[PDB]
């Protein structure tokens, strides 16, 4: 079992990035979730970059290189 | 079992990025979710970049290279 | 069992980054979650960078290199 | 069982970064969570950097290098 | 069982960075959590840096190097 | 059982960095938690640095090096 | 510089399997060489087998297999 | 510089399997070499087998296998 | 400089398996060499087997296997 | 400088398996060498086996295996 | 400088297995060498076995295994 | 400087297994060497076994194993 959450440069209001594994006889309730935004400037901004999602990376030679100038 | 969530440069209101695995006799309730936006400037912005989603990457030689100038 | 949460440069209001594993005969309640933003400047900002999510990285030779200039 | 939470450069209001493992006959309640922001300047800001999430890293030779100039 | 919480450069209001393991016949209640911010300057700021989350790192030779200039 | 909490450069209001292990027939209540901030300058600030979270690091030769200039 | 001599199942009389490299201002003399054979039985005999002479063998997968029954 | 001599199952009389490298201002003399054989039985005999002569063998997976039955 | 001599199951009379390196202002003499054989039985005999002569063998996985039945 | 001599199951008469390195202003003489054999039985006999001659063997995993039945 | 001589199961008469290094202004003489054999039985016999001659063996995992049954 | 001589299960007559290093202004004489054998039984016999000649053996894990049954 592999669980990997990556969260970056965001504005949230609730109930995020959750992992529920292997429950038995459970029960739950969540409530209302409000996002209210007025007059903001430069919210939720991210620079460059690549996103790799792999399971096995075998024998990688001179690979996975990112250059920023 | 492989679970990989990547979230970046966003504005949300609720109930995101969840992984529910291997439940038995469960039960749940979620509520209303409101997004209200007025008069914003430059929200949810992302720069360049590539997105790789693989399962196996074998013997990668001089590969997976991104250059930014 | 592998659980890895990485959270970075964000504004939240509640109920984030949770991992519930291996529960039996449980029960829970969560409440309302409000995000209210007015007149902000430069909220939730992130610089460059790459995101790798792998399970096995075997024999990586001269790999996984990021240069910033 | 592996649990790794990394949280960085954020503004929160409640109920974050929790790990609940191996409970039996439990029960719990959480309350309302409010985020109220007005007139701020430069909140939740992060510099550059890469995020690696792996389970096994075997025989890594001259790898995992980040340069900042 | 491995539990590692790292928290850095943040502003919180409550109920963070908790690990509940191996409970039986429990029960608990938490209260309301308010974040109120006005007129701040340079809150929740982080410099550069990389984030590695692994379980096993075997035979790493000349690896895991970060240079800052 | 391994439990490691590292907290650094933050402003909190309550109920943080807790580890509850191996309880039987327990019960508890927590109260309201308020964060109120006005007119501050340079709160919750962190310099550079990398974050490694591993379980086993075997045979690391000339590794895990960070240089600051 | 690569020099590989393999000699097998033979009858010789002299001056075999020599490698002279990188000489300067040299000089040499060899003598007479006589092979005299009478009435022999089953001299210089070899069983089956393949002869590979390569310089580079890269990425050979399930190759170079000889079966004898 | 690589020099590899393998000699097997032979009858010789003289001056075999020599490697002369990197000589300056030398000089030498060798004599007569006689092989005289009469009435022998089963001289210089070799069983099965393969002969590989390579310089580089890279990444050989499930290769170079000889079976004798 | 690499020098490897392997000699096996032989009958010789003289001046074998020599390596002369890095000589300056030398001089030498060798004499006569006689092999005389009469009426022998089963001289210079070798069983099965493979002969590998390589310089570099890199990353050999489940390779170089010989089975005798 | 590497010098490896392996000699096995042989009948010799003289001047074998020698390594002369790094001589200056030398001089030498060797004499006659006689091999005389009559009426022998089962001389110079070797069983099975493989001969590997390499310079570098890197990262050999489950390799170089010989089975005798 | 590496010098390794291995000699096994042989019949010799003289001047074997010698290593002369780093001589200056030398001089030497050797004499006659006679091998005389009559009527012998089972001389110079060797059982099974492999011969490895390497210079570097790095990171050998579950390798170099010989089984005799 | 490394010098390793291993000699096993042999019949010799003279001048074997010598190492002469680092001589200056020397001089020597050796005499005749006779091997005379008649009517012997089971001379110079060796059982099974492998011969490894390496210079560096680094990080050998579960390697170099010989089983005799």
- Report the distance separating Cα D41 and Cα J31, nearest Å: 98
I53, H7 Cβ separation under 8 angstroms? no
G47, H45 Cβ separation under 8 angstroms? no
CA proximity to I5, closest of J19, J14, H23: J19
Q: Domain total for chain F?
A: 1
CB contact under 8 A, C55 and B2: yes
Chain I nearest-CA residue for H54: I54
Q: Is F62 on the interface with D (CB under 8 A)?
A: no
J55, K56 Cβ separation under 8 angstroms? yes
Domain that holds residue K3: 1-69
CB contact under 8 A, H47 and J48: yes
**Pick from J4, J8, J31: CB nearest L53:** J4
**Pick from D33, D44, D60: CB nearest E60:** D60
Q: Is E51 on the interface with C (CB under 8 A)?
A: yes
% helix / strand / coil in chain J, to the nearest 5? 0, 50, 50
Q: What value, to the nearest 5°, has the Cα angle with vertex D25 and ends D23 and D31?
A: 80
**Pick from B32, B33, B65: CB nearest A65:** B65
CB contact under 8 A, H52 and I53: yes
CA proximity to D20, closest of E2, C22, L67: C22
Q: Classify burial at F60, counting beta carbons within 10 Å of its beta carbon; exposed 0-12, middle 13-18, buried 19 or more.
A: middle
Of chain J, the end-to-end C-alpha distance in Å amounts to: 38
- H–I CB contacts, 8 A cutoff, strictly below: 259
CB contact under 8 A, J46 and H9: yes
As beta bridge partners, residue I57 has H57, J57
- Structure-solving method: cryo-EM
DSSP I53: E
- Report the distance separating Cα D58 and Cα D64, nearest Å: 12
Which residues of chain L are within 8 Å of residue K22 when distances are taken between CB atoms?
Answer: 21-23
CB contact under 8 A, A60 and C55: no
CB contact under 8 A, J51 and I48: no
How far, rounded to the nearest angstrom, does the alpha carbon of residue E69 sit from its chain's CA centroid? 26
Strand order of the sheet with strand D51-53? B51-53, A51-53, C51-53, D51-53, E51-53, F51-53
How far, rounded to the nearest angstrom, does the alpha carbon of residue C7 sit from its chain's CA centroid? 3
Are there at least 3 beta-carbon pairs closer than 8 Å between L and G? no
Tokens for B7?
A: 């979230």
- Report the distance separating Cα D30 and Cα F62, nearest Å: 48
**Pick from C6, C9, C31: CB nearest E53:** C6
Element (H, E) at B56: strand B56-58
Which residues of chain I are within 8 Å of residue J14 when distances are taken between CB atoms?
Answer: 13-15
Q: Is E10 on the interface with C (CB under 8 A)?
A: no
CB contact under 8 A, E42 and F39: no
E8, D7 Cβ separation under 8 angstroms? yes
DSSP K37-64: EES--S-SEE----EEE-SEEES-BS-S
Nearest CA-CA distance, residue F51 and chain D, Å: 8
CB contact under 8 A, C40 and A41: yes
Tokens 């390793």 locate to: L4
- Report the distance separating Cα D51 and Cα K42, nearest Å: 70
- Report the distance separating Cα J8 and Cα H8, nearest Å: 10
CA proximity to J52, closest of F12, E23, I51: I51
Tokens for C52?
A: 């790798």
């Amino acid at each position: 079992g592999f669980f990997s959450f990556i969260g970056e440069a965001f504005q949230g209001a609730g109930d995020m990035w959750r992992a529920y594994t292997d429950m038995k006889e459970a029960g739950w309730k969540d409530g209302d979730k409000y996002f209210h935004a007025r007059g903001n400037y430069d919210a939720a901004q991210r620079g460059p970059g690549g996103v790799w999602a792999a399971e096995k990376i075998s024998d990688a030679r001179e690979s996975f290189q990112e250059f920023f100038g």
